[PDB]
């Protein structure tokens, strides 16, 4: 899974 | 039984937040597993698989069935102390626990601070450009 | 920092309750000492030197300067688990601490129950006497 | 010291 968009 | 502020240290509490988690039996990132790794479910309209470490506040989406939540926490926030904690909750000393809660508090602040920083820099870019535009019209 | 329910486990909190305690430097039952022994100050109009163990709820008045609060706790409530606790607060495990808080909870109930027993017995005396008075002529 | 009385 990836980091949040921001 | 235990104050609300501290409940997220308990695996059984964390698990309980995974109300409508899609990845269940058959998957590597089950609630038991997500919880063991320190994740709270906190989904949005926007990304309904959203999950946050309760301790270091790193937020992660785009979860896939074969994702090992621990490997992901390690990859995406390698400096999270919760990862270092080997003892079970009941086996911690109060000093140890308090040492941990202070770190978390500091982590929460650092997250809030970094957010404000990025929002402020965004607001500053809008203002700067607007003023340049007026200087351009000149 | 720590929830209000649990603060009485901390010596520094206990000490703080002794706002107007008469027995200070020179005396055996100083606040530092009273607190070490588990006492909260909780004075009344009636007995303004009143002190309670936060753990076993035993209440003791008529304090004298040479009173060693630990000896008094031992004497007047020998079964209080807080006395058995040798570790400092920070050295306890959460399990140990939780084991202790459960015991305290039970102690509180037992005390409330014994008070209700005493109040009921008092009410029963008043009733008995009233009936005896009415049986007369 | 001594047990509170009622
Ligand atoms: Zn973390
Ligand atoms: Zn006691």
Domain of B84, in residue numbers: 1-138
Sheet containing strand C59-61, edge to edge, reads: C39-41, C51-53, C59-61, D2-3
3-state secondary structure of B76: helix
Mention every residue, 6+ apart, whose C-beta is less than 8 A from residue C111.
C57
Q: Are strands A2-3 and B59-61 parallel, antiparallel or unpaired?
A: antiparallel
DSSP per position, chain D: -EE---
C124: its two tokens: 């029963």
> Ligand nearest B72 Cα, by number?
1
Establish whether chain D is in contact with chain C, requiring a minimum of 3 CB pairs below 8 angstroms.
Answer: yes
Q: Check B97 against C98: CB less than 8 A apart.
A: no
Known binding residue C53? Answer is yes
What is the C-alpha to C-alpha distance for residues C72 and D1, in angstroms, rounded to an integer?
7
Asked whether the beta carbons of B28 and B70 are under 8 A apart, the reply is: no
Instruction: Give chain C positions within 8 Å (CB) of B89.
Output: 94
Q: Which two tokens stand for residue B81?
A: 């102390």
| Contact present, B39 and B53 (Cβ < 8 Å) | yes
Q: What share of chain B is helix, strand, coil (3-state, %, to 5)?
A: 55, 5, 35
Technique employed here was X-ray
C85 Cα distance to chain centroid:
17
Query: Residue C59: beta bridge partners?
Result: C52
What secondary structure does DSSP assign to C8-38, as a single string?
GGSHHHHHHT-SS-S--TT-SS-HHHHHHTT
Write down the residue that tokens 């698989």 correspond to: B49
* Cα end-to-end distance, chain C, whole Å: 67
The reply to whether residue B94 touches residue C98, judged by beta carbons under 8 angstroms, is no
Resolution (Å) of this entry = 2.6
- Contact of B97 with C95, CB cutoff 8 Å: no
Given the DSSP bridges, would you call strands A2-3 and C51-53 parallel, antiparallel or unpaired?
unpaired
- Kindly compute the dihedral angle of the four CA atoms of residues B101, C84, C55, B99, in this order, to the nearest 10 degrees: -10
d(CA B23, CA D1): 64
Cβ distance B93 to C91 less than 8 Å, yes or no, reads yes
Radius of gyration for the alpha carbons in chain C, expressed in angstroms and rounded = 19
CA angle B90, B92, B94 (to 5 degrees): 110
Chains A and B: 3 or more CB pairs within 8 Å of each other: yes
* Total domain count, chain C: 1
Q: How close B88 comes to chain C (CA, Å)?
A: 10
Cα angle, residue B98 at apex, residues B93 and B104 outer, rounded to 5°: 130
- CA dist C83 and C69 (Å) reads 11
What is the C-alpha to C-alpha distance for residues B97 and B102, in angstroms, rounded to an integer?
9
Q: How many CB atoms within 10 Å of residue B88?
A: 11
């Amino acid at each position: 899974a990836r980091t949040k968009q921001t | 039984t235990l104050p609300p502020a501290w409940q997220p240290f308990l695996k059984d509490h964390r698990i309980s937040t995974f109300k409508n988690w899609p990845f269940l039996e058959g998957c590597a990132c089950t609630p038991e597993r997500m919880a063991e790794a320190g994740f709270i479910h906190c989904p949005t309209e926007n990304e309904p698989d959203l999950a946050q470490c309760f301790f270091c506040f790193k937020e992660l989406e785009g979860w896939e069935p074969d994702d090992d939540p621990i490997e992901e926490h390690k990859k995406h926030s390698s400096g999270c102390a919760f990862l270092s904690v080997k003892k079970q909750f009941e086996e911690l000393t109060l000093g140890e626990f308090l040492k941990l809660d202070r770190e978390r508090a500091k982590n929460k602040i650092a997250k809030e601070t970094n957010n404000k920083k990025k929002e402020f820099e965004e607001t500053a870019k809008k203002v700067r450009r607007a003023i340049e535009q007026l200087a351009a019209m000149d």
